[PDB]
Write a protein that binds this ligand. Sequence first.
Ligand SMILES: [Zn+2]
Lengths: 36, 156, 177, 146, 94, 73
Amino acid sequence: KNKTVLKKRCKDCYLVKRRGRWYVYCKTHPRHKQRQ
Amino acid sequence: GYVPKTSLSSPPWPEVVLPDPVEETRHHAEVVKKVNEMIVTGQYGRLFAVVHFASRQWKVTSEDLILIGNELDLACGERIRLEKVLLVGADNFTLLGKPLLGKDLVRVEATVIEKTESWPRIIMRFRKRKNFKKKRIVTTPQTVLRINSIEIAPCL
Amino acid sequence: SSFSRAPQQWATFARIWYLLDGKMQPPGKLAAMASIRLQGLHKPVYHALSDCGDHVVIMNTRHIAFSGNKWEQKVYSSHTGYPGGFRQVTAAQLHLRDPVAIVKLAIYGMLPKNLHRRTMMERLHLFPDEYIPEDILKNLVEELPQPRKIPKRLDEYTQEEIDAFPRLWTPPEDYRL
Amino acid sequence: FREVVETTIIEGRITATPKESPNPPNPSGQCPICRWNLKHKYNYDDVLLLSQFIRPHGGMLPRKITGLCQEEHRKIEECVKMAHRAGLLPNHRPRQLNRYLTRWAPGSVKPIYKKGPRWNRVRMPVGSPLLRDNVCYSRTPWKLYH
Amino acid sequence: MTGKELFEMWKIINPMGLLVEELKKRNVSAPESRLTRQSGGTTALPLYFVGLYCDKKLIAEGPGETVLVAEEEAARVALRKLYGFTENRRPWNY
Amino acid sequence: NCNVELALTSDGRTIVCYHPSVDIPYEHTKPIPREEGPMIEQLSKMFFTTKHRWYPHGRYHRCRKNLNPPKDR
RNA sequence: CCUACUUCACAAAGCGCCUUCCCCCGUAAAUGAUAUCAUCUCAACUUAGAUACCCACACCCAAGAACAGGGUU
Ligand SMILES: [Zn+2]
């Protein structure tokens, strides 16, 4: 999912800059996964 | 105040320290004495001189020609003392002035050889789609000088 | 002074060979020095029609250093005229194929865009290694000073240099590292 | 510092701490950069000043321990990044194209397949803008974008 | 003679022989030739500057397309220097 | 390079430069050592130029060339 | 490309026969700092990750519009 502004929606969601993009990675619900 | 030697502490152009004025005036006296003692004995060869005649400066060596774009109102063959000398150089020294060397130091003399017209110089104007088209021919007046002497006095 | 007419002219106009080491340097400071010397813009005899340009021998041009993400972000584009022959390669891929092409393309762009440009580009000799043919080493005259001052690493510092730099801070005694 | 020696017996031993050089020329500052008058006077080049502030595996030391200002910590952090990618700290490895002043990480930049028109060009960033406050020994300033 | 070089006016062949003899009159030993500068030496357009020396110091030097031409031309340059007829000689005082 | 001795005369209306000519030292000196297409390639690679300079040119172009041009100096 | 079949017939063809050789990058990992846990790292880092072809008169030709090319022992 590309979100131009990243939300968060659980504890486990965490923002990490990889490959030039901010991503929201999550482990409990991988549905949270986002991309700038 | 003290700064450790990093990349950008001391700027990359080299540090030169200006000498104190006492030994530097001693140095200047030594140099001027050398150059004047060359001039008194003729230790030079032939001279050139940058000379600010009609409106523009010429690098003038003795025995040569200079074409000047105006009529100088002098009869032909008539000697002239080109004042406004502003550099005089030899094989082993130069003397440049601020801006002009004194008249008491350098004499540059020339003659007027010939007093010609130039070639016909065409002045055409043209603007298109407008029937604008004009022609003129201008023959300018020119006088050719021959520079004889560049003599230098040892008055420094 | 006091030469004859033919040797005075021959001394004035005849061309000089300039070596130029290209290790660690960017290809545009090399290109700027070499372009000035290929045109003849380092001579007070310079005239555009005079054909007064000199010879330039740029060596070690495998060890060029673009100043930054240029090695991945600079693209060289060409188009073989066939439909679909548009080829863009980054500076890294172009450098891997032919390890001379980046300095040559930099120099080619710097030079004025007239018909002298390919006369000039033949006076230029680019070699990718330290190896230069012997028939060119016997012609060289000056080795031009490198345009980027190469900064040296931790391993190359002497002991006096390290001792001269102060330690700016006290670390706490109980610290893991 | 201390080290954790393991062999099975494991121990923690404090070993041979350095200490600051005696007289900071401008004491009673806050960060060690201030106390030696180096606020705007270094670059990515200088690997002594950068190498004092670095874990022996290339990582950089936290603010709360080394005592920097926030600004000079970010500056030294970016200068470490630009000194590692140029190949200036070879002793600090985690265990061949030549660069310097790389702002961004090398394997993660998409190339400029369409540099734009001149009035909206896509440029190549060079160096870091966190060093915008150094001394300018030039009239034409740092071109940070190429 | 204004602007005419000497050996446009006094045409000589074998200039080094005249120079060697002229140094024999001044009680000076034979001149040593020394290739001071050079360029393009293995190409079609060389440039050798050859200097004529007499006891560790040079009396003259001159350029040329080959070594022999530059050598004899340095000899002519020194011959202009010895006689006093250089290109910077004091102009004729009319 | 530059090795000159610069000075003012005492009043300060001229600048006197002393520049002698420096000779080359003896130590800094060496002793003297004692078809048509393929034609244009050989000449080009001899003289480091492109091929186009050696291709001939028309009678009309050769007929505008001035063969008694003015010399000087 | 023509051995067969087929149009055809000292050839040309398809409807017949033969040959056709390797990569695409976005993610998923391990070690690990700023931030002493952690973290794939627009931090230093470690994994999945081009050969071929070519190349010294005349007459006839499987070469050819002309020219060219090949052959004439
Ligand atoms: Zn501070």
